[PDB]
């Protein structure tokens, strides 16, 4: 077979842990626990081929900045997440996450992922964001950010609904096995 | 008063090698932990090595203080002092 190291990064609470646990266990975490680091594995059929994924969960908090970058050596692909329901986490892709992974792993492919798409049209989220003068990220905005940071692709998912999660990691594999110029 | 955790997550650096992110079994002797760490970096003679805080304190890790290590602490593999 063939293994691939995939690290998932992004702001605290954007949904990194639920993404990974849903993908690898088909269960949605019952309780939020801050991540320190976690190494998961998956074997996935991707375009008729069986691939091993060596998956890493990271702490998004600035408190663990140095710890997180110790997980980056030998990474083959980064999945950078922002929450569709938190525009500040989108801006931190531009200001923190994309520059940090490129600083540590020059030219390593990046998949951009908008999480929690089930919240985009939820009235309560819409009302809470409106009190902050905000609105959920649109798919076109997600594409525009992917273009800006030279991500291989923008994808959206809801780990809670188990909607689009499989496709994120299949595209991560393709970024390593079928490099695009 | 609550007891310490029996497993703790740490990162360990060895200058020139790739870092190791691992969970430490706190019921396992520190020497066995160091042997596991050393094995990963193709190092033998583990009793000639020690773990020390990577941050500015640079305290050495011992059987008597390993209970104070929190999850997410960065350690450095070094030569034992004595
Ligand atoms: N509505 C919704 N909530 C989510 C989703 N994924 C995660 N969450 C919630 O968002 C919070 C943070 O999720 P988590 O995966 O731990 O984020 P992390 O801090 O990036 O690891 C938790 O309360 C989760 O239940 C999702 O797809 N939809
Ligand atoms: Mg997490």
Residue numbers in the entry:
A (entry chain A): 1 to 181
B (entry chain B): 1 to 82
What is written in the article reporting this PDB entry?
Next, we determined the crystal structure of ELMO1-RBD in complex with RhoG at 1.6 Å resolution. ELMO1-RBD interacted with RhoG via β1, β2, and β4, whereas Raf-RBD, a conventional Ras effector, uses β2 and α1 for binding to Ras. The interface buried Leu21 (β2) of ELMO1 in a cleft formed by RhoG switch 1 and 2 regions. Substitution of Lys9, Glu13 and buried Leu21 of ELMO1-RBD with alanine (K9A, E13A, L21A) dramatically reduced its binding affinity to RhoG in the active GTPγS-bound form. Mutations of several residues at the periphery of the interface (Y18A and K20E) also slightly reduced its binding affinity to RhoG, but a mutation at a distal position (N58A) had no effect. Furthermore, two ELMO1-specific residues, Tyr18 and Pro19, were found to interact with Gln74 and Pro73 of RhoG, respectively. The weak binding of ELMO1 to Rac1 is probably due to the substitution of Thr69 in RhoG with Pro69 in Rac1, which breaks α2 helix in switch 2. Furthermore, Cdc42, in which Trp56 in RhoG/Rac1 is replaced by Phe56, showed even weaker binding to ELMO1-RBD. Thus, the present crystal structure clearly provides structural evidence that ELMO1 binds preferentially to RhoG.
The current model suggests the GTP-bound RhoG recruits the ELMO1 N-terminal RBD to the plasma membrane, while the C-terminal PH domain stabilizes binding of DOCK DHR-2 domain to Rac1. The solution structure showed that residues 7-80 of ELMO1 create the core RBD domain consisting of a four-stranded β-sheet, two 310-helices and one α-helix (β1: Ile7-Glu13, β2: Lys20-Asp25, α1: Leu30-Gly40, 310_1: His46-Tyr48, β3: Phe49-His53, 310_2: Arg66-Glu68, β4: Thr73-Thr79, respectively). In this study, we have determined the structure of ELMO1-RBD alone and in complex with RhoG, and verified its targetability through computational nanobody design.
